[PDB]
Design a protein around this nucleic acid. Sequence first.
DNA 1: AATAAGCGGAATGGGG
DNA 2: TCCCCATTCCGCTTA
Length: 91
Amino acid sequence: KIRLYQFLLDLLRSGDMKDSIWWVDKDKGTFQFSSKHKEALAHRWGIQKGNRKKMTYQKMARALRNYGKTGEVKKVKKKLTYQFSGEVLGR
DNA sequence: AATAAGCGGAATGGGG
DNA sequence: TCCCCATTCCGCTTA
């Protein structure tokens, strides 16, 4: 099954939910969620995963925080903004 | 206060 | 057995 970070990178590459997520500095791998439209993207993640409950942005961000130690995605000190690792972007 | 983002410990669930 | 990769629940903190 797809991993969360790859789901997000795939969306940014396809442009399919441009009102929910976007690059801030694509060369650096920084991206940002929409305050008003992030829940539709969270819903899509949960449905893709076949999870029992409806996915929320809060639960999705709880999973995102677990990448901080291994490095795939780190939180940036800007509202709703994160950064992929060079390894993730190169692969 | 109302609203929202940010945090993470802990329990629970996936699929090996 | 026991790690993978989350999901779900809950309470607190910061803006």
